[model samples]
Structures are given as C-alpha cells and as structure tokens.
Target: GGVDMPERFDAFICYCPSDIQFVQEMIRQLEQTNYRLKLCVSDRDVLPGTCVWSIASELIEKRCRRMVVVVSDDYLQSKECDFQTKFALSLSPGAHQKRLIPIKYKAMKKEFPSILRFITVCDYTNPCTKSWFWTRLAKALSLP
Candidate 1:
C-alpha cells in the first residue's frame, strides 16, 4: 500500500482539508520568501489510487525531515491528523530533533496533545507577527 521510501520533500504539511486556504497561503508565502521550503501537501502531492494512510505514514516516518502541523480544533479532531502527530512524536522520541512544527491556526477548546506540551508553537493569530513567524519557522527548519 505504501512505498518503502519517498523522495523527501523539505517538510510534510499535516492539515485539515477545511483549512486549505490558510495552508495554501502559508505555502505561497514561504515559496515567495528568500528562504525556500519544499512542502509536501497531501491533497496536491499524494498520488491517486495509493493508500493514503500508508503513504502518509511513510512520508511522516521516513521521507520528510520535519512535520509541520496546522493545528485547529478540526485538525485535532481528525484521527488521521492525530495519527500523523503521534507517529512524528514516535520518531523523535526523547528529543526535538525530529520536530513537529505546530502552527496554531485556530484556538483549541481542549487541552493540547501531551507530547506538544514542551514544544513552542507558532501563533498565526496576530497579523503583526506574520513576518516574525515565518522567520522563526525558517530557523526551525535550519534554512539559510
């Protein structure tokens, strides 16, 4: 169902379908910026007729170096999104090397994931911080 290894993209964007506009804008900005980032977006990049879960697992586990999570109540509610976060955490295990980059796109009503408690999240809520947010993101990815 899944390919053993996928040619890696810089990062995999784990997001809710309903938040497509937001994610697309983020991608567009990143692409336009001086620091380029290659992102694997599920809807556009995942091949047709393939087992999505399997390919997604392999991408999260082996292909991409980091996982960029677009977090909202909807994202947290999806089992598939939860699975991606859990698997990324498993890969990193006691360190932040295999990091999960969480962008808090919407407010969360529930307590956040336990694994994400210690990690810093990028808050896109304030339009004023947008540039700073992208800068921090580039640093997180170790981009030049």
Candidate 2:
C-alpha cells in the first residue's frame, strides 16, 4: 500500500537554462495530459542574486515531489545541472529511491553521469518522441 499523495504533483522537472524551450514544451504537453509538474528552469522560480541558484536548489528540495533531470551535453557540463543532481541525492531520504529520473535529450560523448546512471531513464537523444513521455511519467508517478 502507498501513502496517498494529496492533489500535489506528477513530477518536478529540473533542466538547464539552455534547455528552457524543450522543458517548457514538455511542461505544456504534461499539463495537457493533466500531469502536475514544477517548471524549475523558467518562470519566476529563479531568484535574483549571487546565490540565485540556491533558490532553485531550495525549491527543488522542498516542493518537488519527484525530480526529472533533463540530461544533455551542456547539462552534463553545466555547473548548475551538476549542483541540481548532487543536491537531489543529498536531499532525498533514500539514494535508491526511484523518484529521481533522468531523461536524455541529446547525444553526448561521455556516458550518462555516474550519479544518475544508477536508475531507470528515458531516452530522448535522437528521434525524441512524445508518445511514451507521458506514459512513462504516468507510470513513474503511479497514475492510472
């Protein structure tokens, strides 16, 4: 049996600023599918200041029900994305909890980041399709 979740979330999305467009597009489709999500890459969630990324980190830690890291070459290289990945591990109660998911959005020379490679992931690198995106998300969140 699962602890019932309130009318809260389907998943929380974490992505690089460069990937904002794709994140937004995904958010749109998710909303259409009636999936609740948090768009951390865009909107006013990002605070203004030297430690603005901390704001994102804090928000991601507290409000997000689950995390979907949008992985790509730039995402792997980005310090912010790295912070998000590392921090998610530290904040989540169990390291092996399946709530943290990685979605590959592009081809990268390096293998998937070691931290994120340990779990189930969705491949969107090339021929990135939308059909399974919602289905997989729905399954991950235990939606009917």
Candidate 3:
C-alpha cells in the first residue's frame, strides 16, 4: 500500500528571493519525492501583488502541515519571513510534534524563534554530503 498524505500540504519551503536558484533546485529535488511541498516564493506561480505577504501567511496557516525555512542572512533580515516562521511556531503548541524545520542555507547562526528545535535540520553550509540532509528531512517529516 502507498503512504497517505493528508488533504493539505505536508511540507513547505520558506526561502528568500536572494537564493531563488538554490531554492528552485531544492524544490525540484523535494518534489521528486513522495512528500507534498508548498514552496511559497513568487516563483511558485503566485500572481503579482502588494498582498503577497498576506497570501503567503494565509497559505501557511491553512494548507501547510509544516514548514522548511531556508535560513540565510537574507532570510533573517527579512521581516516577512520572520513573521511567517513565528506564526508557524505559535501554531504548534506541542513542540515535539513540531511543524517547522530550519535548513541552513549559508554560514550563519540563525536561532529559531524558540519552538522549532525539536526536529533535526538540514545543513548546507559545509561541504558535507547532502545525502544525510534528505534522510534527516524525511525522518523529521516522517515521510513514508
């Protein structure tokens, strides 16, 4: 039997526009897997508007089961990304039943806003093989 995904998103890709290339590649890799990903960048076929931030938040709240925040200096500097992450953390009262995963995209020590430390994160800083990243990510999301 095949694994079942819920009616909505099982994972989300949170990234900054600065790293669009990397994020796009990651999305392709992620999408090839069994997980349902909600990548919330302008590149995900969203219409152009001043209300993009509002739309992103709404999507995260209603559709996303969890989020994969691509952490970089640009990401940390962005107010909207911070708000989205904080919102996700607030939604998960049960920390162990975490709904957020932070993926390191650059060489920086970006602290997660309190409630996202339960799950193992992916490291893209060092030259370490990316094999473990996908594995750990799958484990974190409990992919089937």
Q: What overall lDDT goes with each candidate model?
A: 0.65, 0.59, 0.58
Ranked by lDDT from best down, the candidates are 1, 2, 3
lDDT of 2 by residue, 44-69 (tens): 44433211111234555555566778
Determine which window of 10 residues in candidate 3 has minimal summed lDDT: 46-55
lDDT of 2: 0.59
| TM-score to native of every candidate shown | 0.75, 0.67, 0.65
Better of 2 and 3 by TM-score: 2
Runs of candidate 1 exceeding 4 Å displacement: 1-6, 45-56, 142-144
For model 2, the run of ten residues with the poorest summed lDDT: 47-56
> Residue 143 of model 1: what lDDT?
42
> Which should have the higher TM-score, number 1 or number 2?
1
Q: Write the per-residue lDDT of candidate 3 for residues 1-144, one digit (tens) a residue.
A: 985434455565677777666666665565555654434442455324311121245566667666677777677678648765667546636643566677776676657545456756677765675766654565556441
Global Cα lDDT for candidate 3: 0.58
| Model 2 misplaced stretches (Cα beyond 4 Å) | 1-10, 36-56, 91-94, 126-130, 142-144
Worst 10 residues of 1 by lDDT: 46-55
How high is the lDDT of residue 22 in model 2?
A: 65
RMSD of 3: 6.2
Candidate closest to the true structure, highest lDDT: 1
